Each structure stands twice: as structure tokens, then as C-alpha cells.
Structure 1
Amino acid sequence: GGKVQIINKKLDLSNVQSKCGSKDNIKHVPGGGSVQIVYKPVDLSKVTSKCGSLGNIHH
């Protein structure tokens, strides 16, 4: 058959926080969570594929 694959994976911000079996005392704690900021992102890409014919031809 013949495949053409063009794959763009750009911006990924992942954040995995876990606590298990915690028997603790917490007092006066700022900034314990999570923050994700993306500021003024411009995504100006071009993707072309000048391709021939596909499928089945008989003569």
C-alpha cells in the first residue's frame, strides 16, 4: 500500500502528584499544589505533502 506519516507533537505539560498512606500534621504551608502557564504562544507552522496518485490503476 505505502504509508506517509507526518506527526507533530509539540507542547505537553504533564504534572503527576500523589500521596499514599499519609498520617501527618501540616501547618502554614503556601504553594503545595501545581501551576501551568503558557504565555502568548504562536504556532505558525506549515506542513505540505505534494504527493502523486494513490489507489489502484490498470492499463
Structure 2
Amino acid sequence: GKVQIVYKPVDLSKVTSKCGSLGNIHHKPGGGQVEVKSEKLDFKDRVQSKIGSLDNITHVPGGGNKKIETHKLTFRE
């Protein structure tokens, strides 16, 4: 006999923003100091690392809106 499986979700969603103006932004942090002392670094299978990092970031996207959706039909997993 018939097996009928229908996966048909409808998506009419909206993610939105309306901004009149995005101002005066001043990213002026005082000068940072980073000091890392080590004797030996020994890395093997799939290790990932950041050592002694000083990052200054000003992002300010004006939208910066995001949508994430995952649709899945699965029989064994």
C-alpha cells in the first residue's frame, strides 16, 4: 500500500530594521599591553590556538539583521 510523506513548510517571515541615522561613534580605548611568556609550545592532532592577541574592533553594521533556519527530512541518522 501507499506511503506518502510530504515535507512542505511555508516561510513568509521577515527580519527587518529601520534606523533614522547611526550617530557619532568613538572607539578610543587606551593602548593595551599583552605579554605572553612560555618555554615550549607542542601541538598535535587538530589543535587550534591564538596566543598574545590585542584586537580593537568597531563593527556598526546599519542593518546587522540575521536569519538562520535548518530544514531536515531524515530516515536514519
Q: What TM-score, normalized by structure 2, do the two folds share? A: 0.24
More relative contact order, 1 or 2 (CA 8 Å, 6+ apart): 1
Q: Which has the higher strand share?
A: 2
